[PDB]
C-alpha cells in the first residue's frame, strides 16, 4: 500500500555549509563545498516522510561529460568514500550529511536521488554543487596546517605584487577577487576549454583530483598562447588597441573581459599580470598560492645554465610567478610544499608555453631532473652571467660578469601583514 516518496525540494543549506567549508562568499546562490569534509542536505517531502523500514534511497554524483566510477567522476552510495547518513527527521523534512573523498576531482557535480519501496525506482535530480580543494583537510593534497597561512593564501582577496628593480623596489595593490560573483564559474570554464579537455574530456575531469595537474593546466591557460588562454603579452610600450599592463588593478576585469568576448585573448598583460590572474584562479579553486617577484631574472634559451652576452640573452629588472602549496606523490618523497608555477610565456615545455609545477626545494638543491621545468627556473634565480668578448686580435674570450647578479631579493607578501617577506633563501643558498 505504502506509496512512493514525493520530493518537494532539496535545501542545499548554503549558509551553514558556506561557513563550515570556508566558502561563504561563494555560497550566496549555489552550493560550493570543499572536498573531504561533510556537508548538510535537507529533503522536504510532500506526502509522507522517509521510513527506514519501507524506503531505500540511493544517491548518484557525476561530474564532467563522461562520468565513470573507474575515473572517480561518478559515485553511487546508499542512504545509511562517498557517504550519506540520516542526522535528523522532523515532520516533513529529513536532514542528511554527505561526505566526499579527499582525493575527489574538483568541479561541478550533479546530485541525483533514487528512491524505491521494493519495486520501480523513481529518480530525482536534487541540484548541483561545486567541489573545491580543501586546505583545511589533513588528508587533502593541498593541506596547509597553519590557519593564519590558509587565511592569507586561500581566503585573502587583496594583496601586494612587487615590481621595480633590485635597487629600487616598489609595489602595487592588487585585487585578486577570487570570491567575487562569477569568477568561480569563469575558472571552471578555463578548465573546460583547456587543450586536454578538448582532447579527452573524461580523462581531464578525472585528473582534476590533483593540484599538480590543475596547477600545470593553469600555468598554460593563463597565457593565450597555443590555446584559448586568457592574456596576450606585450612589452613594447604601445597598447593603444588594448589595455596597458600597468592599467590593471585586479584579476577580475581581465577574467570577465575574457568570458564576455567568448574566451578571447585580453590585450594586454606582462609578467605580474599573468602571475596575478593565476593566483586568482588557483585561490578560487582552493590551492594556496602566492605571487613572488624575482629581481635580475634571467632568461636561459639554450639550457646551459649561463646567461650569455656578445660584445644574446636577457636579464629582466623583475619577473613574477606564483607558488602553490601541495604534496608531490608523482616525485621522490620530500618535495611537498611550495611549487613554482609560471604562466608568463618564455620557454616551451612539452611543445607549449607553460612552466611548473616544480618544487622550490628542488631548485635550491639543484635537483634539476625533477619535473616540471627545473632547469629553466634554476637559471632564472641562480645563473652565471658570461660575456663572449671579441678581442683586438680577433679572438673571443669568455669572461664572468659579476656587475649584475641574477636572482636577488626574491619577494612575496608577508602573512597577514602589509609588508614584504624576502624568500631568497628558499630558492638558492648564500655563497
Amino acid at each position: 500500500m505504502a506509496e512512493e516518496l514525493v520530493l518537494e525540494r532539496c535545501d542545499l543549506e548554503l549558509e551553514t555549509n558556506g561557513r563550515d567549508h570556508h566558502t561563504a562568499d561563494l555560497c550566496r546562490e549555489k552550493l560550493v563545498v570543499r572536498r573531504g569534509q561533510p556537508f548538510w542536505l535537507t529533503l522536504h517531502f510532500e506526502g509522507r516522510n522517509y521510513e527506514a523500514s519501507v524506503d531505500s534511497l540511493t544517491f548518484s554524483v557525476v561530474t564532467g561529460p563522461a562520468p565513470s566510477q573507474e575515473a572517480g567522476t561518478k559515485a553511487r552510495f546508499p542512504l545509511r568514500d562517498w557517504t550519506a547518513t540520516v542526522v535528523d527527521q522532523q515532520d516533513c523534512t529529513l536532514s542528511l550529511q554527505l561526505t566526499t573523498p579527499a582525493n575527489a576531482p574538483i568541479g561541478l557535480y550533479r546530485l541525483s536521488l533514487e528512491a524505491s519501496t521494493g519495486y520501480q525506482g523513481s529518480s530525482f535530480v536534487l541540484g548541483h554543487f561545486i567541489l573545491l580543494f580543501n586546505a583545511w583537510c589533513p588528508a587533502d593534497a593541498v593541506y596547509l596546517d597553519s590557519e593564519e597561512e590558509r587565511q592569507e593564501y586561500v581566503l585573502t582577496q587583496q594583496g601586494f605584487i612587487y615590481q621595480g628593480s633590485a635597487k629600487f623596489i616598489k609595489n602595487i595593490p592588487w585585487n585578486f577577487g577570487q570570491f567575487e560573483d562569477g569568477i568561480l564559474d569563469i575558472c571552471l570554464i578555463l578548465l573546460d576549454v583547456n587543450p586536454k579537455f578538448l582532447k579527452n574530456a573524461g580523462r581531464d575531469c578525472s585528473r582534476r583530483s590533483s593540484p599538480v595537474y590543475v596547477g600545470r593546466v593553469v600555468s598554460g591557460m593563463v597565457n593565450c598562447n597555443d590555446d584559448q588562454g586568457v592574456l596576450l603579452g606585450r612589452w613594447d610600450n604601445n597598447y593603444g588597441d588594448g589595455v596597458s599592463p600597468m592599467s590593471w588593478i585586479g584579476s577580475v576585469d581581465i577574467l570577465r573581459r575574457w568570458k564576455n568576448h567568448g574566451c578571447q585573448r585580453v590585450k594586454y598583460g606582462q609578467c605580474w599580470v599573468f602571475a596575478a590572474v593565476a593566483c586568482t584562479v588557483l585561490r578560487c579553486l582552493g590551492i594556496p598560492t602566492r605571487v613572488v617577484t624575482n629581481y635580475n631574472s634571467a632568461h636561459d634559451q639554450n639550457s646551459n645554465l649561463l646567461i650569455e652576452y656578445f660584445r644574446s640573452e636577457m636579464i629582466w629588472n623583475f619577473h613574477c610567478w606564483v607558488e602553490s602549496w601541495m604534496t608531490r606523490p608523482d616525485l621522490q618523497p620530500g618535495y611537498e610544499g611550495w611549487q613554482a608555477l609560471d604562466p608568463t610565456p618564455q620557454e616551451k615545455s612539452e611543445g607549449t608555453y607553460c612552466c611548473g609545477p616544480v618544487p622550490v626545494r628542488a631548485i635550491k638543491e639543484g635537483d634539476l631532473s625533477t619535473k616540471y621545468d627545473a632547469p629553466f627556473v634554476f637559471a632564472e634565480v641562480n645563473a652565471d652571467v658570461v660575456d663572449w668578448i671579441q678581442q683586438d686580435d680577433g679572438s673571443v674570450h669568455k669572461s664572468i660578469n659579476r656587475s649584475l647578479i641574477v636572482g636577488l631579493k626574491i619577494s612575496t607578501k608577508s602573512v597577514g601583514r602589509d609588508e614584504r617577506e624576502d624568500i631568497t633563501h628558499t630558492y638558492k643558498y648564500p655563497e
Binding site: 612589452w235 600597468m246 636577457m314 636579464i315 629582466w316 629588472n317 619577473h319
Partner: peptide, 5 residues
C-alpha cells in the same frame, strides 16, 4: 613595466 637590462 618589466624591462630587459
Amino acid at each position: 613595466p618589466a624591462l630587459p637590462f
